[PDB]
C-alpha cells in the first residue's frame, strides 16, 4: 500500500483539491485513478476530519457508487492518496456541455440508464442513513455504468429544492428531477441571473416541457420528481415500478 505501487499514466485534473491522475497498478495493470491532496498545510483538526470522511469511503461498496480502493501516505511530501475506480466516461457536467455545444440530443435510452442508476445510487444512500446529485458528480465507466463521486461527502444554486430552500429523502428527488431534466433539454429547469430571482422561479414551479423526441412517460416522471409538494415527488421505489425501466437500464459488469 504505497505510491510505489502505482505509475502515474497523467493528470486527469487538477485543484482546488490537489490533483486527479490516471494511473497503473504495478502488480497486474490495472488501470485506476487516484485524487492527490497536500495536507502539509493543514491544521490537526482539519487531518482528524480528513481522517474522517476518509474512513467513510472505505464503508460503501455498490455498484452505482464509484468505488473505492485504497488510501495512500506520503509523509515525505506530506501527500494524501486516495485511489479509486477509472470512469473512462468522464463526468455527466461534461456530457451537457458537449451536447449543448454540438446542439445534439442525449438518447432516450442514455437518460433511461441515468436515471435508473442514479435512483439505485440513492436508494443505497438513505438507507446507510451525503452525496450530492449535480452532474459534475456523476461519472461514466466503459461499460454504460453510471456511478455516483464523493463531492459533498459563488455559484447559481441550480439544484436547490423548494424545501431547503426554507429549512428530507425527497429533497435528493428533486435534484434528481433536475439532473434529469438537465440531460434531457441541455439546461436547467429553472434559470435566473441572481439566487433571490432563482428562488422566485422555483416558487412559481414553472418550466418547459423536456424536448419533444423525449416520450410524453419520460416527460412526466421528471415532471412528478420537480412537484413543489415534496410529498407528491415519487419514492425510489416508486421510480423503479415506473415501466420505462428495464433491466439493461441497470449496471453490469
Ligand atoms: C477530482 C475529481 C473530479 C473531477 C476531475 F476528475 F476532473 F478532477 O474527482 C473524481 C474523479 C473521478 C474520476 C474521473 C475520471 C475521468 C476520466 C476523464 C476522461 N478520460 C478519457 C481521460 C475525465 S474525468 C475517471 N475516473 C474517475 N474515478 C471520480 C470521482 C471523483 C470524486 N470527486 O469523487
Not at 29 to 46: C, F, H, P, Q, R
Not at 134 to 155: E, I, S, T
Not at 185 to 211: D, H, N, V, Y
Request: glycine share 6%; proline share 4%.
Amino acid at each position: 500500500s504505497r505510491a510505489e505501487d502505482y505509475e502515474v499514466l497523467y493528470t486527469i485534473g487538477t485543484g482546488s483539491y490537489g490533483r486527479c491522475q490516471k494511473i497503473r497498478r504495478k502488480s497486474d495493470g490495472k488501470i485506476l485513478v487516484w485524487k492527490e491532496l497536500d495536507y502539509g498545510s493543514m491544521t490537526e483538526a482539519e487531518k482528524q476530519m480528513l481522517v474522517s470522511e476518509v474512513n467513510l469511503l472505505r464503508e460503501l461498496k455498490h455498484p452505482n457508487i464509484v468505488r473505492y480502493y485504497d488510501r495512500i501516505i506520503d509523509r515525505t511530501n506530506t501527500t494524501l492518496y486516495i485511489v479509486m475506480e477509472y470512469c473512462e466516461g468522464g463526468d455527466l457536467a461534461s456530457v451537457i456541455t458537449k451536447g449543448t455545444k454540438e446542439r445534439q440530443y442525449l438518447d432516450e435510452e442514455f437518460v433511461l440508464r441515468v436515471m435508473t442508476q442514479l435512483t439505485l445510487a440513492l436508494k443505497e444512500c438513505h438507507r446507510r442513513s451525503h452525496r450530492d446529485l449535480k452532474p459534475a458528480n456523476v461519472f461514466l465507466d466503459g461499460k454504460q455504468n453510471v456511478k455516483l463521486g464523493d463531492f459533498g461527502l459563488v455559484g447559481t444554486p441550480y439544484y436547490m429544492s423548494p424545501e431547503q430552500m426554507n429549512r428530507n429523502e425527497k429533497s435528493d428527488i428533486w435534484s434528481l428531477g433536475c439532473l434529469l431534466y438537465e440531460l434531457c433539454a441541455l439546461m436547467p429547469p429553472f434559470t435566473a441571473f441572481s439566487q433571490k430571482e432563482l428562488a422566485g422561479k422555483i416558487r412559481e414551479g414553472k418550466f418547459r416541457r423536456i424536448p419533444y423526441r423525449y416520450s410524453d412517460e419520460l416527460n412526466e416522471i421528471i415532471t412528478r420528481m420537480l412537484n413543489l409538494k415534496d410529498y407528491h415527488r415519487p419514492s425510489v421505489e416508486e421510480i423503479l415500478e415506473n415501466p420505462l425501466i428495464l433491466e439493461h437500464h441497470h449496471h453490469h459488469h
